[PDB]
Design an enzyme around this catalytic site. Structure first.
Site, PDB file in Angstrom:
ATOM      1  N   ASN A  10     -22.841 -27.773  37.986  1.00 23.89           N
ATOM      2  CA  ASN A  10     -23.593 -28.245  38.985  1.00 23.89           C
ATOM      3  C   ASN A  10     -23.748 -26.866  40.028  1.00 23.89           C
ATOM      4  O   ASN A  10     -22.809 -26.436  40.579  1.00 23.89           O
ATOM      5  CB  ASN A  10     -23.260 -29.162  40.146  1.00 23.89           C
ATOM      6  CG  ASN A  10     -24.231 -29.707  40.980  1.00 23.89           C
ATOM      7  OD1 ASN A  10     -25.317 -30.225  41.016  1.00 23.89           O
ATOM      8  ND2 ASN A  10     -23.701 -29.239  42.124  1.00 23.89           N
ATOM      9  N   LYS A  12     -24.195 -24.145  42.818  1.00 22.50           N
ATOM     10  CA  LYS A  12     -24.198 -24.365  44.315  1.00 22.50           C
ATOM     11  C   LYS A  12     -24.165 -22.999  44.690  1.00 22.50           C
ATOM     12  O   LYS A  12     -23.863 -21.967  43.870  1.00 22.50           O
ATOM     13  CB  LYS A  12     -23.084 -25.053  44.872  1.00 22.50           C
ATOM     14  CG  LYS A  12     -21.724 -24.506  44.602  1.00 22.50           C
ATOM     15  CD  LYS A  12     -20.560 -25.301  45.431  1.00 22.50           C
ATOM     16  CE  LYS A  12     -19.220 -24.529  45.295  1.00 22.50           C
ATOM     17  NZ  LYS A  12     -18.464 -25.264  46.229  1.00 22.50           N
ATOM     18  N   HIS A  81     -24.638 -35.723  45.709  1.00 24.64           N
ATOM     19  CA  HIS A  81     -23.465 -34.968  45.527  1.00 24.64           C
ATOM     20  C   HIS A  81     -23.036 -34.800  47.137  1.00 24.64           C
ATOM     21  O   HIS A  81     -23.570 -34.989  48.021  1.00 24.64           O
ATOM     22  CB  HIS A  81     -23.910 -33.599  44.927  1.00 24.64           C
ATOM     23  CG  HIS A  81     -22.822 -32.671  44.518  1.00 24.64           C
ATOM     24  ND1 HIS A  81     -22.297 -31.783  44.992  1.00 24.64           N
ATOM     25  CD2 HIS A  81     -21.976 -32.790  43.297  1.00 24.64           C
ATOM     26  CE1 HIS A  81     -21.137 -31.310  44.355  1.00 24.64           C
ATOM     27  NE2 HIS A  81     -21.058 -31.881  43.233  1.00 24.64           N
ATOM     28  N   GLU A  83     -21.795 -32.982  49.425  1.00 21.87           N
ATOM     29  CA  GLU A  83     -22.332 -32.202  50.754  1.00 21.87           C
ATOM     30  C   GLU A  83     -23.712 -32.747  51.204  1.00 21.87           C
ATOM     31  O   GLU A  83     -23.851 -32.720  52.297  1.00 21.87           O
ATOM     32  CB  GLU A  83     -22.443 -30.814  50.479  1.00 21.87           C
ATOM     33  CG  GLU A  83     -23.628 -30.174  49.582  1.00 21.87           C
ATOM     34  CD  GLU A  83     -23.485 -30.591  48.208  1.00 21.87           C
ATOM     35  OE1 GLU A  83     -22.359 -30.912  47.803  1.00 21.87           O
ATOM     36  OE2 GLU A  83     -24.871 -30.876  47.573  1.00 21.87           O
ATOM     37  N   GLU A 153     -16.593 -38.016  42.765  1.00 23.46           N
ATOM     38  CA  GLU A 153     -16.174 -36.741  43.588  1.00 23.46           C
ATOM     39  C   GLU A 153     -14.867 -37.137  44.280  1.00 23.46           C
ATOM     40  O   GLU A 153     -15.125 -37.966  45.363  1.00 23.46           O
ATOM     41  CB  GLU A 153     -17.245 -36.137  44.204  1.00 23.46           C
ATOM     42  CG  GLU A 153     -18.384 -35.539  43.517  1.00 23.46           C
ATOM     43  CD  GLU A 153     -19.510 -34.842  44.530  1.00 23.46           C
ATOM     44  OE1 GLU A 153     -19.125 -33.605  44.860  1.00 23.46           O
ATOM     45  OE2 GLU A 153     -20.241 -35.640  45.004  1.00 23.46           O
ATOM     46  N   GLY A 159     -11.334 -28.796  49.067  1.00 24.42           N
ATOM     47  CA  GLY A 159     -11.530 -28.063  50.236  1.00 24.42           C
ATOM     48  C   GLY A 159     -10.420 -28.474  51.436  1.00 24.42           C
ATOM     49  O   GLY A 159     -10.182 -27.771  52.457  1.00 24.42           O
ATOM     50  N   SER A 199     -11.635 -30.908  41.045  1.00 22.81           N
ATOM     51  CA  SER A 199     -11.218 -29.586  40.228  1.00 22.81           C
ATOM     52  C   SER A 199     -10.950 -29.813  39.031  1.00 22.81           C
ATOM     53  O   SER A 199     -10.286 -30.669  38.798  1.00 22.81           O
ATOM     54  CB  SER A 199      -9.826 -29.302  41.154  1.00 22.81           C
ATOM     55  OG  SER A 199     -10.278 -28.628  42.122  1.00 22.81           O
TER      56      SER A 199
END
Length: 233
Positions: A10, A12, A81, A83, A153, A159, A199
């Site tokens: 994906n 980004k 996704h 975000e 996800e 993060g 990850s």
């Protein structure tokens, strides 16, 4: 047994990664996907030639744009996704509507769900994640699931300095599959690809894939993606 796995990357040097991909002999059965933001679609489409790969669009929510993508030769799309939800404000229902529109426009859809750190720490993984997929299911008919792929996800481990284990991944994939089995059908559950979208690298991809309810990956567009593909046996 497991359905056909998917290795999806994906977005980004994009050109150099595509050449790497093109040169990669992939010896087993896996659908590979390269998902591109709109501006990179044309170049990716023309440079990527490995026949075990398909191009995917991202985030298109307008019917005319979906039709144009399809006309353009793009048959896959990634929606929901993380975000899109925590930043752009796509609600459960907005994502669901996008998923439904895409399915109706003839797309294979990778629909993403997943909970935040705050949500996971409040013990609300299940209610959050299942509420997200429930909204998607509400806008679909049973036959549509043949065109749907779920990506989990662990936003909570993206993060945040938190680290997901294969057991934690399996736990999440399992509760998703169990919901699908009960609410949609065990037949649908058995065929559904659920991809891990946290990850991943060459060190742990193979370990993650060994989990019962993991059917592949939604990962970054990076050189190690080759190792992620190979991890899908």
């Amino acid at each position: 047994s497991k359905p056909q796995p998917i290795a999806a990357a994906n977005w980004k040097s994009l050109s150099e990664l595509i050449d790497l991909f093109n040169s990669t002999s992939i010896n087993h059965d896996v659908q590979c996907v390269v998902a591109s933001t709109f501006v990179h679609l044309a170049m990716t489409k023309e440079r990527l030639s490995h026949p075990k790969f398909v191009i995917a669009a991202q985030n298109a929510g307008n019917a005319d744009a979906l039709a144009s993508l399809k006309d353009f030769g793009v048959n896959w799309i990634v929606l929901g996704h993380s975000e899109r939800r925590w930043y752009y404000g796509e609600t459960n229902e907005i994502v669901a509507d996008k998923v439904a529109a895409a399915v109706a426009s003839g797309f294979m859809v990778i629909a993403c769900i997943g909970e935040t750190l705050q949500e996971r720490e409040s013990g609300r993984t299940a209610v959050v994640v299942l509420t997200q997929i429930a909204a998607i299911a509400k806008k679909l008919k049973k036959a549509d699931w043949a065109k749907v792929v779920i990506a989990y996800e662990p936003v909570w481990a993206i993060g945040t300095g938190k680290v997901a284990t294969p057991q934690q991944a399996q736990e999440a994939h399992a509760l998703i599959r169990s919901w699908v089995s009960s609410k949609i059908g065990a037949d649908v559950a058995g065929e559904l690809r659920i991809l891990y979208g946290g990850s991943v690298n060459g060190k742990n991809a193979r370990t993650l894939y060994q989990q019962r309810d993991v059917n592949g990956f939604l990962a970054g567009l990076k050189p190690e993606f080759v190792d992620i593909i190979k991890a899908t046996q």
